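hey team, just a heads up i'm posting the complex here instead of the shared drive bc the drive is being weird again. everything in one block, sequence lines first with there labels, then the predicted structure for the whole assembly after. its two chains so it's a bit long, scroll down
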Amino acid sequence: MEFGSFLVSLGTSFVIFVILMLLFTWLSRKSGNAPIYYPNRILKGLEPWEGTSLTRNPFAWMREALTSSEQDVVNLSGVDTAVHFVFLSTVLGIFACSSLLLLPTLLPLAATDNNIKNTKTFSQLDNLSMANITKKSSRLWAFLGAVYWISLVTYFFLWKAYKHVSSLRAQALMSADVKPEQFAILVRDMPAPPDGQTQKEFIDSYFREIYPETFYRSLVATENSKVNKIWEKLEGYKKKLARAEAILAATNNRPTNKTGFCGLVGKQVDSIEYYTELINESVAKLETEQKAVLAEKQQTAAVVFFTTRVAAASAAQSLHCQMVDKWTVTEAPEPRQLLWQNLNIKLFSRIIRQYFIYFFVAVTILFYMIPIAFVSAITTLKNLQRIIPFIKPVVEITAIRTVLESFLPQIALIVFLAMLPKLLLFLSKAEGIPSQSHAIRAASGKYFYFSVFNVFIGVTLAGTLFNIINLLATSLPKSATFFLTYVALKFFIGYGLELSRIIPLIIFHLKKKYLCKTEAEVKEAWYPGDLSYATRVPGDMLILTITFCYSVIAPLILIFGITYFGLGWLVLRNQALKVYVPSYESYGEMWPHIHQEILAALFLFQVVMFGYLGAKTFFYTALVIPLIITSLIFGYVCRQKFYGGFEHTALEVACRELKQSPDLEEIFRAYIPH
Amino acid sequence: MEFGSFLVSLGTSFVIFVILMLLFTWLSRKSGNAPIYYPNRILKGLEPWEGTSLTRNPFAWMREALTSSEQDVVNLSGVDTAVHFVFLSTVLGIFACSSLLLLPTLLPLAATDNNIKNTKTFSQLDNLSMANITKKSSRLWAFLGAVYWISLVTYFFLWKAYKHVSSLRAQALMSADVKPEQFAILVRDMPAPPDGQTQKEFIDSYFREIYPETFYRSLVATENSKVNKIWEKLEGYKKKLARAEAILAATNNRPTNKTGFCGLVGKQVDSIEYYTELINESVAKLETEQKAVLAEKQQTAAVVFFTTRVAAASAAQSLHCQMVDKWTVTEAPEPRQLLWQNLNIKLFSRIIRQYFIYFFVAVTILFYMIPIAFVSAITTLKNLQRIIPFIKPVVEITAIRTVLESFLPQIALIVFLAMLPKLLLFLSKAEGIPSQSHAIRAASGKYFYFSVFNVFIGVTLAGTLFNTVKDIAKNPKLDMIINLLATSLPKSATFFLTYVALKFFIGYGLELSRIIPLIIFHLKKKYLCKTEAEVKEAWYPGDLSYATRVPGDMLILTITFCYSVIAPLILIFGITYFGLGWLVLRNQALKVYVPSYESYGEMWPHIHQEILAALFLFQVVMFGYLGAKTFFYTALVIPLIITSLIFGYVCRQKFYGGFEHTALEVACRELKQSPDLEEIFRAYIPH
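-- predicted structure starts here --
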């Protein structure tokens, strides 16, 4: 019955994906939906291209995507998205070459043997797996050569893509213009000022010693939580007064508000004047607090500004005081990336929080594994049928009952998986990470480990429970069925939902028609947001992890991986061409993390291949040990070969970049939060 | 080992030690011995002993040693020897506290138990060890408490020591004079000029852009291997001609050289005229070659000199080109430390050589595992008797087997572990290491791997098998474990007692008495050698030789952590080893040895990493043992291992970053005094 289960799930996913595709064709063909299907190119208003109206058969939206050079993507969005695209491209290339060799040689090899049905059918695809292969068979040699070739191919593609990303980084850095993050460093962990002088007088006359005639200013970090809170309160008050003024300018007859707190407690009489007195009182209070904070709440973190890229880039890898405890220095993140909150955290606090968060993550795997499986089994009562509701017995088809009992576990799992990334991002920022990009990358790494351990081990154990030498052997083929479902579920809808973009489109065209969106305020009406690498990269790493897991056992997941990453390349190329706009520009710094994962997945599932063929019990599984040690060798040689360039900007892309006498004053007041 | 061999080895070591001490204290009172027992304070003339006719002979030097502060050693020998001394002192403190708690509360527990008689031979040393503890005994709880306490004590002393060494390094760097290694970097792994243009024209006009008005000159590392050969040969000719003319002046008889048979017995040629014509020809050839190679024989390594310490120190941690394959930059070593041949090794070549050397190190790990098995076979000759009865005729009388047991295995171990360090230092120098200090510390690390694996594992396991392999006729899985483990481990513990005793007694007697370099002296003078004064190179003492001292010391440290619990008689031997080492090496450093390089304490983090590696590995050993003793302490040592890893990471994160570089305070606020910057140059010239 499992055969029918994933057959039906695949059919439903394909059908609904087709539905959303047709909707996309229907919706995007209208000019009224341009802001939701072309948020980009409206900002920096490149006039979203329509040309002729319709012919409806050819040339819909493909020529725009497939004819986009990496230079075009970098110019239009940035060099960061092109890194994600080269990640997708190298994964696609690995899987394409792997399929082109594996499948024509392993499909017939698996077809001929009949070990399954001899150890005494469940499903036909079970014949096309490394389970219909007899014990002590010569086909073990072909299988081992296959995994060996997989390792060789992925090594080659990783090296090529990593050279390419290093070249793209060196190209983007060298041609950049004057940016405020090129003249600053982020000094943390300073001692208390000696006797009476405040922190500002201490930071100065210290850097003014080390760096005479090449030091400009210092923006000491101050606890401003009160200043923040009152500031967004005042900004929201100004926004409300502005929308009220626009309403007045429209109707010229001040309407009546729903008098009260959320329309419950109060008298809204000429609310314009209420908000006016509120905002001016808030301005006075904010002025007083802003004056107060700059003199008393002066903490132990400070951005430091130099006068030349040479000095700033050189005074960011150097060690300033002969104790790693004090005056720790790193390159200042760009203003859009500084987390003023997570500064001020001393080194010991950073270490202790790092290990407490990692331990809490491990406890998260544990309290996921046992308790959430327990409560999911509890939800099975709601899943099948409940006596208490008086639902009319009209359904009467068991097939969709099976569909529901397949979805509900997956639905709950996905709900908690979507609860994850916010929690992991919040935890990542709790180690005191001083930049948004590093926080997002650490969250992605934590989610990757969680996903691998959790999903892989849990589904493997579930397969073992369903069905010691045959323990690792027989169990894995059945687990492929579950992944064939879940991969497929995330396969169609997620790419379908993003491409169709109906979920933002449902929110749009309704926030405008209803009481919301009185004034134009179109910018935040349809602001797209980032690519949110907190959810793209770890999900694609999970798909890659599964594909390299069953890369050899059941070489039918390879075609699913290829089609997944091909559709991802296509849809995300279209999106980055027309939809998203980045909020931070990390110049491809992300990608070494992706390289380390990819290699970690390859290492882990070379180990899995070793163990699984050891379950096949032939004295040649030791041949995997050279592959494991080779993965270690490749990791170290890559680390020393490229990783240096991805942490800093070398003193050529900073020195001879030919600045044009920067004012150094608009570089300042660019890190000012106020 | 049985009682006779252990006792006779201890007695022989003690008697030779006291003989050497008596010889030293008697023979140090002779003025002629000054440049032997006081090489230092003769160089840098200081009137070695102040006064007349030093009394208190056994303490004439001991009193002069216990009253010397770390500041005195730093001012007299250097800031590197003081690091070795804090290493010795902290190991001594760890083992002192460990003894003060372990011994009184652990030894009686082993003494009162009677796991012995389970044999259905040994020593009383085995009775005062783990083997005497029965199965599932409450005393193993005390033993677990003991290992937990020793781990805590080591953590405490390591942290305190590492703060102290960081303080010493800061105090030394902050007050050092104008030394040429502070203004320079070692620019290595360059590309080639893609035109008609010499390499030096390319190193310039490139750094002149990155560091304008703060870039002074740049030596390109010209390959001079054959130039070096001709220069050393010329200097040998100079020395030999000086010897000949000194002989002629001292005897007024025309010297005659019979060149042939390695220049000893051959064709008779007139000495000084031959040497003069040959030396002038050699000078002409040398200067022609130097002119021909200082230009146009360029390669892809260089040394760069800035003008201010701030720029020089800042532009050494930085990254120069946006590809780490090009313009690799590291802080320049001292001119005395640079290995000019190891430059001109591109990054891939360096990695390939590193990996080949590591693999060869593993192969020779096995090839030394073999004679370690031989040693562990020899040490238990009685059990070796029942196997291979070919040794029955030779092992008949008490005395012969006694002397073999007492001497031979220790001598074999010494021979192997003393031939090894030269090989390891040569191997490390082939990894493209660009300095002498890094090569020495890498050789020390490889020696630590050899020590741990071969010595510890091989000796203990070979003794285990050869004490049990012939008694595994029956195969009860539960039963063979206990017999194997208990009847095995304390035997290796006793052998290591003997070995460590041999080391501290004989080695420190030889070092303190210094007779071997003294027999070379007083004989290289009275015989044909040492005709001219030339005293300086006749008794030049040399370094502390950290390539051979720290390795052996860490081997003894690992052994003491071996049987700090299993057989807590090792603890006394380790304490006395390190105490005698402290005392003797103090006397040496204050008076005898003078270093050739100054690393400003960069070597101690490696020492800390080893020490913690030993602690980790033998928390693991205790975990395996208590758990092969059949009780559930298994979960009581995993927390110790986890906290060991956390301690390692925390120490690396808090202090290690301060050892690799000199901060930009000791560089700026060092208050320069108008450095010449020209005599700073031509101090890195290879000649």
